[PDB]
Amino acid sequence: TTFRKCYERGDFPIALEHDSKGNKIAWKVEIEKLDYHHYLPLFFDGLSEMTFPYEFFARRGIHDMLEHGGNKILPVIPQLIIPIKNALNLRNRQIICVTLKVLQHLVVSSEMVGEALLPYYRQILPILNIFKNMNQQKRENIGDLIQETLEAFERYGGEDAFINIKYMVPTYESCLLN
Amino acid sequence: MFKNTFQSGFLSILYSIGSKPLQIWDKKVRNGHIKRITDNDIQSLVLEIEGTNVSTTYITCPADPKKTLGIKLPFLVMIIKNLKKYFTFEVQVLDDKNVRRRFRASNYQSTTRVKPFICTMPMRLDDGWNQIQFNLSDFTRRAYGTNYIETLRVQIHANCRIRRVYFSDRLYSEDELPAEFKLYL
Amino acid sequence: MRECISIHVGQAGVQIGNACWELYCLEHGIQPDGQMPSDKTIGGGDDSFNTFFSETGAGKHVPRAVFVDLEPTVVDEVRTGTYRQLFHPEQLITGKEDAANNYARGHYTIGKEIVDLVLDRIRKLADLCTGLQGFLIFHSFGGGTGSGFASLLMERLSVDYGKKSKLEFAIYPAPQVSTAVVEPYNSILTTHTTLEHSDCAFMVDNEAIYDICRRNLDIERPTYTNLNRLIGQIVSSITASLRFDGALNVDLTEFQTNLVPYPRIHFPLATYAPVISAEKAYHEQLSVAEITNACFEPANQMVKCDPRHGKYMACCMLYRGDVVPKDVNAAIATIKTKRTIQFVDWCPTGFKVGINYQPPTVVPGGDLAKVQRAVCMLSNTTAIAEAWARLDHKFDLMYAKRAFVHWYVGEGMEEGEFSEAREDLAALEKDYEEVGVD
């Protein structure tokens, strides 16, 4: 893939910490005054990537700028769209679990997200619609994460959000008035 | 070629005092010459490339066409002495789309031409020892609206008086430059 | 997980790292091709190598050590050597200039433009490595080039990473042998620059290595080959903890903590008892009692300081092979009873034990014997400060007459460095006696 070679070449000053069996990280140059447009989706390609030690960077940094960078995602969303569905087609259980987690954090991160995402469901949803039900130690139940995603989504999405999600998902239920 | 090396710092590709500096520079000699001769102002050996026709005789990088350049830095500086003649040079790069593209700086050029695979630029300048400066991302952004990513080859033509070509990430000032970079007459 | 990163700074460090890494590939049975026989040990880098080598899916071990050089002859020689296919091309970081032994030259002239390079290398290994408990630095106090280079890189690694352990190893200045009379100059520069950031420094001396070699290794004309084999055997013994398992597993952090009582002085000394010729082992016997007595025998240390002039604070015994704890505790109890042994009243307990099951194997083309019980004995005692007294009465006279400081004034540094360093060392001695006294 392209992001792995991009960093193997090197343009991201990110530091780290580490110990016996667990997790932690650092960085070298701050993100807010570097960029959220020229580097956000390129780094997101690491999500579709699955290889040590690159996935560490992906899984964490994706959260990191989410906490640290709220009022900038506004225009970058169509660029964000692509690696999402690429990883979804990649069809790996662990990868899609990591996705589900980070996408959960994405939607809850800030405002305006669902309303701007209005044009952008018919590509992300239906593959999940079919992922619904193939199947708490470390949050491993695919189906539970799926219903959590739909739950956190629809109420914040808006008004016809649920009806279009329903049109995707014939099981789908209301979390609003039932 | 040497991708494993560090784009950090400065990249002198050719520098005159090198004993045998022509490895990765394929030469195409025709009705011309390559010569290695001192100057009067720097009174130091420099390269001289001349020929009857400039398209016939030209130096290029890399030597193996089956190899790329592999450079990230978007800033280029050449140390040239104008010789009151007809010189040009060429660079080819790979972009955000992964389609190849060329830039053609020609001293004669009477106009500016944009072709889907290559851009052209006239060169006019003073005499004596002067300098070249260019920004790959700048020009690609302005012309093709794409985003510079890496370099793949570079070619230089005749009618030129040569000290050093080098690359840098940014527009560097005049004081961080080493003494050999700090040209004096 | 459980791994570390090594730096081999110096002309002085290249021979020793070369021999060592030979030894490691050897005990692991690593083919000079870069891959194994039909036996199943290759993968993503999770097995005995995984601390040292990084054998990728391509099947090629990547040792986690950076060898830095400034005189290209040696590095190009090893580049033309045997294991170059193993050795990554630019991991063998090479410079094209020489500092002429000058600490100031190697600390201001060359380092700046190469420190970013070595930083890039170490960060691009730090990404791929998992646990990285610390760093194993091979250097020398009188670095014919390594001194200033090591000092500056130590500065930068301290400032960016003040979280992890730092382990330094150096051939100590010979008290009565010196190729250069500016060795005290640059060595004290290095020491005073280290002390405020140096985590754990261990020293060794070549004269006593020679003495051991004609004492019980039956060699009168030694070579760096045997020198390196033995020092590498010491470091191999210490890394066997990571390699194999044992009755208990100890760690470099434990050593750091429990070996030094008080800051500044973090300079204990090694000792390896069971060195003997092959025939001597063949027709003699090894056991914990005599090996303990030997490693406590005054002429069995690589630094010539008399224990009856010293006083004991910290000790650490590591056994490798087949032993039991009964004789261990019995022997150490006998030691505590022994009156010639002089510990400080501060620590009724003053030792750290470690035990590993795995037998010490033998390198082909070595000069050791076929051992069944091995021990590394690491101790800090009061007998050390005589060396620094020696060095200071050496330094003060040559500073009063300030011989050949014009080289230093030409390269552009001043005397305030020496000024501060002299009283810094003096503070170190005064520390030593105020802790020696009860």
Place this chain on the structure above:
Amino acid sequence: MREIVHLQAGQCGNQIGAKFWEVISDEHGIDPTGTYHGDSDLQLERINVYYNEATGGKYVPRAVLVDLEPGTMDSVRSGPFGQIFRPDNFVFGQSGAGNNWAKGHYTEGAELVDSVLDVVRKEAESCDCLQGFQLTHSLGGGTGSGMGTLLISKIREEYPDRIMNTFSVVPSPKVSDTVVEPYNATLSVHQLVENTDETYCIDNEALYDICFRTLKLTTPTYGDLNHLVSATMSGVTTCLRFPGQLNADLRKLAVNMVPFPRLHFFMPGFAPLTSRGSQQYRALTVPELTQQMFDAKNMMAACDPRHGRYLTVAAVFRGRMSMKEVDEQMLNVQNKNSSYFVEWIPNNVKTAVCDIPPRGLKMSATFIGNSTAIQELFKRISEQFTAMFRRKAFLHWYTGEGMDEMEFTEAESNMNDLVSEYQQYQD
């Protein structure tokens, strides 16, 4: 029903529990794979105090295994029973301990306590009616101390109604290895006396002496020492799982054993120990069992109570016996030394009678006692703490962690109060 849950904390606790669980599985005849072979009904129906059933008739241990060094539990896994130990149960650690009590007490545990509490409370739900839990670690064991402190502290408040058995091995008086070990031990023992109810006392030097005394086998394994000690703890746990007229409840024992809240430390004793000749040079009778049982030689816990007096004693006796033998034995020993006990409480002997004898031998017994034989230990630790706190050696590490000397002052003060308490009560 009523059940207990095991905890293996620290690099010892892990290996200890390895020996323990393999031994128990042997005793009840479960194959290492996990498919029990029907041999003993009563054990089959009693096993539910400790094991939980997994489909196919597989009886998972209810032990929570914790440490920070991967190699320990990985080697235990490579052992022949990690297959019956569960991957779910294994919790790993993001640090080399450094054998630093403060590190293992404030920073590393700060992010593990949540998860380990959730796992153990899941286990609590798995069980139905608890008596409490038991723990195995070392007082000097850095990780075990630094974590067990916090975990026991929490479990105390969430379940103030249950018995928190503590089985911490006691280090050698003559060697400690670690030099900050007395600091760590005092730190631990402060909150130890503050929370705990049962505390065990076991010493390596005593084990070595016994090995040379009767084991007579030259070179054992520390694993063989664990063989012995896990045999002892199996014996003390035989009561709950077995029929026969004895009273099993550890609380039934502790109420008898503890006259006062500041009494926590208890000294085991084990019944027949045999050497090569003696297997056929010895017979099996209550008088000789009791004689050997009450011997400072057979004593293995801390040190000889010959300097002091016995306060409470309690023993269980396993096999087919009657009452009269133990009656006459206690009366005998009472009369032989009516001196060496205390007037304060007369008749300080408590006994239990387990019918089901061990596999391999007919007659056995265990004994746990409180006597004035810890005074040497904590006077030693007092003088050690003072000796290396007169000038505060190694203090820079724990300051870097962020502690202060007042903690040490108050802890040693509490320890000295316990010293005075133990001294005054017997004199």
